[PDB]
Amino acid sequence: WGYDLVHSLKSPYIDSSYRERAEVLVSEIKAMLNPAITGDGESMITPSAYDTAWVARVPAIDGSARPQFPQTVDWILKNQLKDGSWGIQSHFLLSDRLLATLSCVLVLLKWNVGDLQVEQGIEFIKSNLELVKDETDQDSLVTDFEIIFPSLLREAQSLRLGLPYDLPYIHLLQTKRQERLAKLSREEIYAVPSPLLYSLEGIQDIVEWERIMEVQSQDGSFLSSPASTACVFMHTGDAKCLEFLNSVMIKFGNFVPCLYPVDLLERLLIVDNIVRLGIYRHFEKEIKEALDYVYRHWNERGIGWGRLNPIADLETTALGFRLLRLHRYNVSPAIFDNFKDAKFICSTGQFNKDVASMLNLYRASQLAFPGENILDEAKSFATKYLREALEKSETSSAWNNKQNLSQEIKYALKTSWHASVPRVEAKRYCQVYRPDYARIAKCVYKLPYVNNEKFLELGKLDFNIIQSIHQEEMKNVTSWFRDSGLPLFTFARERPLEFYFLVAAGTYEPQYAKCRFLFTKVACLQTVLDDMYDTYGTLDELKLFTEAVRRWDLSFTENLPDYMKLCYQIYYDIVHEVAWEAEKEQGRELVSFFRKGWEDYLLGYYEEAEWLAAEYVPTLDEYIKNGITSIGQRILLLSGVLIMDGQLLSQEALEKVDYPGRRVLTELNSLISRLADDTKTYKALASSIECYMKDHPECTEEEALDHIYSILEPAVKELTREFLKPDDVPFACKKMLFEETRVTMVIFKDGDGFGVSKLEVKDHIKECLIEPLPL
């Protein structure tokens, strides 16, 4: 550990050639995304054999005995898989292959073509249906499979195709179809758009086609489904239906996907993945362009996966809410009212979509601002949903197991956005992100703009480069520390890497080296000052030191004990080095401001020192008042935030984030740090818990701990708002303050009082700063 460990590190990723390579990757990705974000190449989605077969059914509008879109028949004839099914070869999902294959067989028969493909298709369906022994063999189900497959199979039955219609699994599907159809309000089908519009081809006996046009989408589709739209067209001859089908053929050529467009969801997924991979700083322009488009279509009724959907989609809406708010767009949690009743619903559609909607709801709820009760309700609801999902057999399907769904749900539930280490989360996501990820709707599909090899290549390389740069900084840190004189204070533990980690794990960009360095110096000094005032020094000694603090005079130290003479000299040097660097960056005088800050901090220590000597137990109000100042976070944060390369803070701007006595960023961080620290420790000078109990002699320790949390939770919401709030404060500065708070909250998470785990601390440093990602 310390000096020897860090100086043993020799990372190759520091060479400029790696950053040059990363820049090529950035350019390639910008080129790849351009059609999606700026051009007309939006909605890049794979073919749906199932939907293509429905479109292939449409007869020529000229009344001749041939398909209107003969290219779709040719596509089907040419795209059968080796095993006789149709679908995406890389991923096998039984329900997807069954549905698509039966769909293709029937249309080939309609047009009396593809005898061999038909024979092979029928064989696939028959043989695979006969492998299903019990329900747990069916695997994950494509959207509305239980509704559609029985009706498609009855079509085959009327043609007397050689299929096993009398299998128990077939009877069970019909049973499930009835169960679904029973809860259907049929009169409302025509009045209120609903998810069933996505699958009208499966409920043809139920729908009055003469009434269905009222819930048609503006583009002529029925909930963006080519199959569902083709079905309505063949029943009605509706001109807008045909226009939608034409538009998809024009876009894709000789096939159609199972959803179109996916313009909103796709843009949000691109942004989400770029952000989670930790590579967002390279794509500011593209992310803004993507979210600007989503925001244009953001409305009080929520959003669908496509901008023309006549009903909102929880998955897309919750994802949009989170990304928009995170990028400082003004959105209101009242949009979640669109997904309520009587509260929340979303337990109807296909399983993966439902789970995705709730994971997104859960994540969105953590971005709550003060007074947003709907998000508290949302969090509770989504948590309960996800814990229940873990216990469902569907979660353990072959398909879901292959994608580690249960693991993903568990990770989300144990992970608090506020108590997260940013660099570590990006590192972990690089290890989970899948370039060839397959999604489920009416069929299995992929979105190559979202899931691709380049994103991951850049993610891993960028992480390694940043880490190698930090490793070189850590050599500088440990080298400075060794010669600094701080090691002479043997009453204080040496923690330079822990303090470096505190800032570096969140403020990681290469240009902020000085910020990280000075922040680390101040934190090392403070841990000595803290031990000196609250443990090692006597009140008479500490009184002398505190007088020296007032005087700012090196000559005055002749009065101090030897160890304090040294401590004062180091303190004085660090304060003024920081001040000099701040004045250089800011272009204005800051020595007096820093000096006042240090005086207030240490006078806070002295007040505490007086309390300790007197065995005085403060009121909670007194404890918190002192603690916000003496916890030391304010002056530490100032020693980093004012020295960020290129980030100018006027007095006016600074007061928006730093102002003793006001609930601004530095004050909230101080309060959160003090109380989170207490909740985590205190059981291992009185703490906030003990103080409250002196204030309320009758109350229990349990009540006391609950009260501290009742203070913490509101503070965290305020911190989030202060961070994300639109204003003219350089965002990099707000983010540095916020991210330092997040890492602090990681250190003190799950406050039971038993103390901080040193092994967890070292493990975080290992993961973040020491061990590279394998390439």
Which H, E and C letters describe 145-181, residue by residue?
A: HHHHHHHHHHHHHHCCCCCCCCCHHHHHHHHHHHHHH
Q: How far apart are CA 29 and CA 40, in angstroms?
A: 17
Q: Which entry of Cl ion, Mg ion, none binds 74, CB below 5 to 8 A by partner kind?
A: none
In the complex with Cl ion, the residue whose CB is nearer, 197 or 438, is: 438
In the complex with Cl ion, the residue whose CB is nearer, 438 or 693, is: 438
Q: Which entry of Cl ion, Mg ion, none binds 662, CB below 5 to 8 A by partner kind?
A: none
CB of 394 to Cl ion, least distance (A): 17
Q: Which entry of Cl ion, Mg ion, none binds 530, CB below 5 to 8 A by partner kind?
A: Mg ion
- Around Cβ 729, how many Cβ atoms within 10 Å? 21
Q: Which residues contact 336 (CB under 8 A, 6 or more apart)?
A: 317, 318, 321, 344, 361, 374, 375, 378
Q: For tokens 């790849």, what's the residue?
A: 32
Cα–Cα nearest to 99, from 161, 46, 156, 162: 156
Annotated ligand binding at 681? The verdict is yes
CB of 455 to Cl ion, least distance (A): 15
In the complex with Cl ion, the residue whose CB is nearer, 408 or 425, is: 408
Annotated ligand binding at 96? The verdict is no
Gyration radius from the chain CA atoms: 31
CB of 685 to Mg ion, least distance (A): 7
- Tell me the DSSP string of 73-129: HHHHHH---TTS--S-TT---HHHHHHHHHHHHHHHHHTT--HHHHHHHHHHHHHHH
CB of 532 to Mg ion, least distance (A): 9
Q: Which entry of Mg ion, Cl ion, none binds 18, CB below 5 to 8 A by partner kind?
A: none
Q: Which entry of Mg ion, Cl ion, none binds 622, CB below 5 to 8 A by partner kind?
A: none
Instruction: Kindly list the residues in this chain that would bind Mg ion in the complex (CB under 5 A).
Output: 530, 534
- Alpha helices by DSSP H, 505-619: 513-531, 539-551, 562-586, 591-614
In the complex with Mg ion, the residue whose CB is nearer, 534 or 610, is: 534
In the complex with Cl ion, the residue whose CB is nearer, 93 or 230, is: 93
Annotated ligand binding at 763? The verdict is no
Annotated ligand binding at 677? The verdict is yes
In the complex with Mg ion, the residue whose CB is nearer, 411 or 491, is: 491
Instruction: Kindly list the residues in this chain that would bind Cl ion in the complex (CB under 5 A).
Output: 434, 437-438
Which H, E and C letters describe 455-477, residue by residue?
A: HHHHHHHHHHHHHHHHHHHHHHH
Q: Which entry of Mg ion, Cl ion, none binds 281, CB below 5 to 8 A by partner kind?
A: none
In the complex with Mg ion, the residue whose CB is nearer, 400 or 679, is: 679
CB of 364 to Cl ion, least distance (A): 24
CB of 438 to Cl ion, least distance (A): 5
Structure tokens at 492: 């204080």
In the complex with Mg ion, the residue whose CB is nearer, 451 or 679, is: 679
The conformation of residue 192, written as its DSSP 8-state character, comes to: S
Burial string for 756-774 (b: 16+ CB within 10 Å, else e) reads eeeeebeebbeebbbebee
CB of 622 to Cl ion, least distance (A): 57
CB of 681 to Mg ion, least distance (A): 5
Residue whose CB is nearest to Mg ion in the complex, by number: 534
Q: How buried is 30 (Cβ within 10 angstroms: 0-12 exposed, 13-18 middle, 19+ buried)?
A: middle
Q: Which entry of Cl ion, Mg ion, none binds 596, CB below 5 to 8 A by partner kind?
A: none
In the complex with Mg ion, the residue whose CB is nearer, 534 or 701, is: 534
CB 633 within 8 A of CB 600: no
Structure tokens at 577: 């080095």
Cα–Cα nearest to 632, from 680, 673, 592: 673
Cα–Cα nearest to 369, from 132, 713, 66, 58: 713
- Alpha helices by DSSP H, 330-404: 351-365, 373-390, 398-402
In the complex with Cl ion, the residue whose CB is nearer, 91 or 735, is: 91
The conformation of residue 261, written as its DSSP 8-state character, comes to: -
CB of 403 to Cl ion, least distance (A): 5
CB of 615 to Mg ion, least distance (A): 16
Q: How far apart are CA 400 and CA 386, in angstroms?
A: 15
Q: Which entry of Cl ion, Mg ion, none binds 534, CB below 5 to 8 A by partner kind?
A: Mg ion
CB 142 within 8 A of CB 108: no
CB of 270 to Cl ion, least distance (A): 18
In the complex with Mg ion, the residue whose CB is nearer, 534 or 600, is: 534
The conformation of residue 771, written as its DSSP 8-state character, comes to: P
Q: How far apart are CA 771 and CA 430, in angstroms?
A: 14
Q: How far is CA 356 from CA 199, 314, 331, in A?
A: 20, 9, 21
Cα–Cα nearest to 235, from 259, 258, 191, 204: 204
Which residues are known binding-site members? 530, 534, 677, 681
Which residues are known binding-site members for Mg(2+)? 530, 534, 677, 681
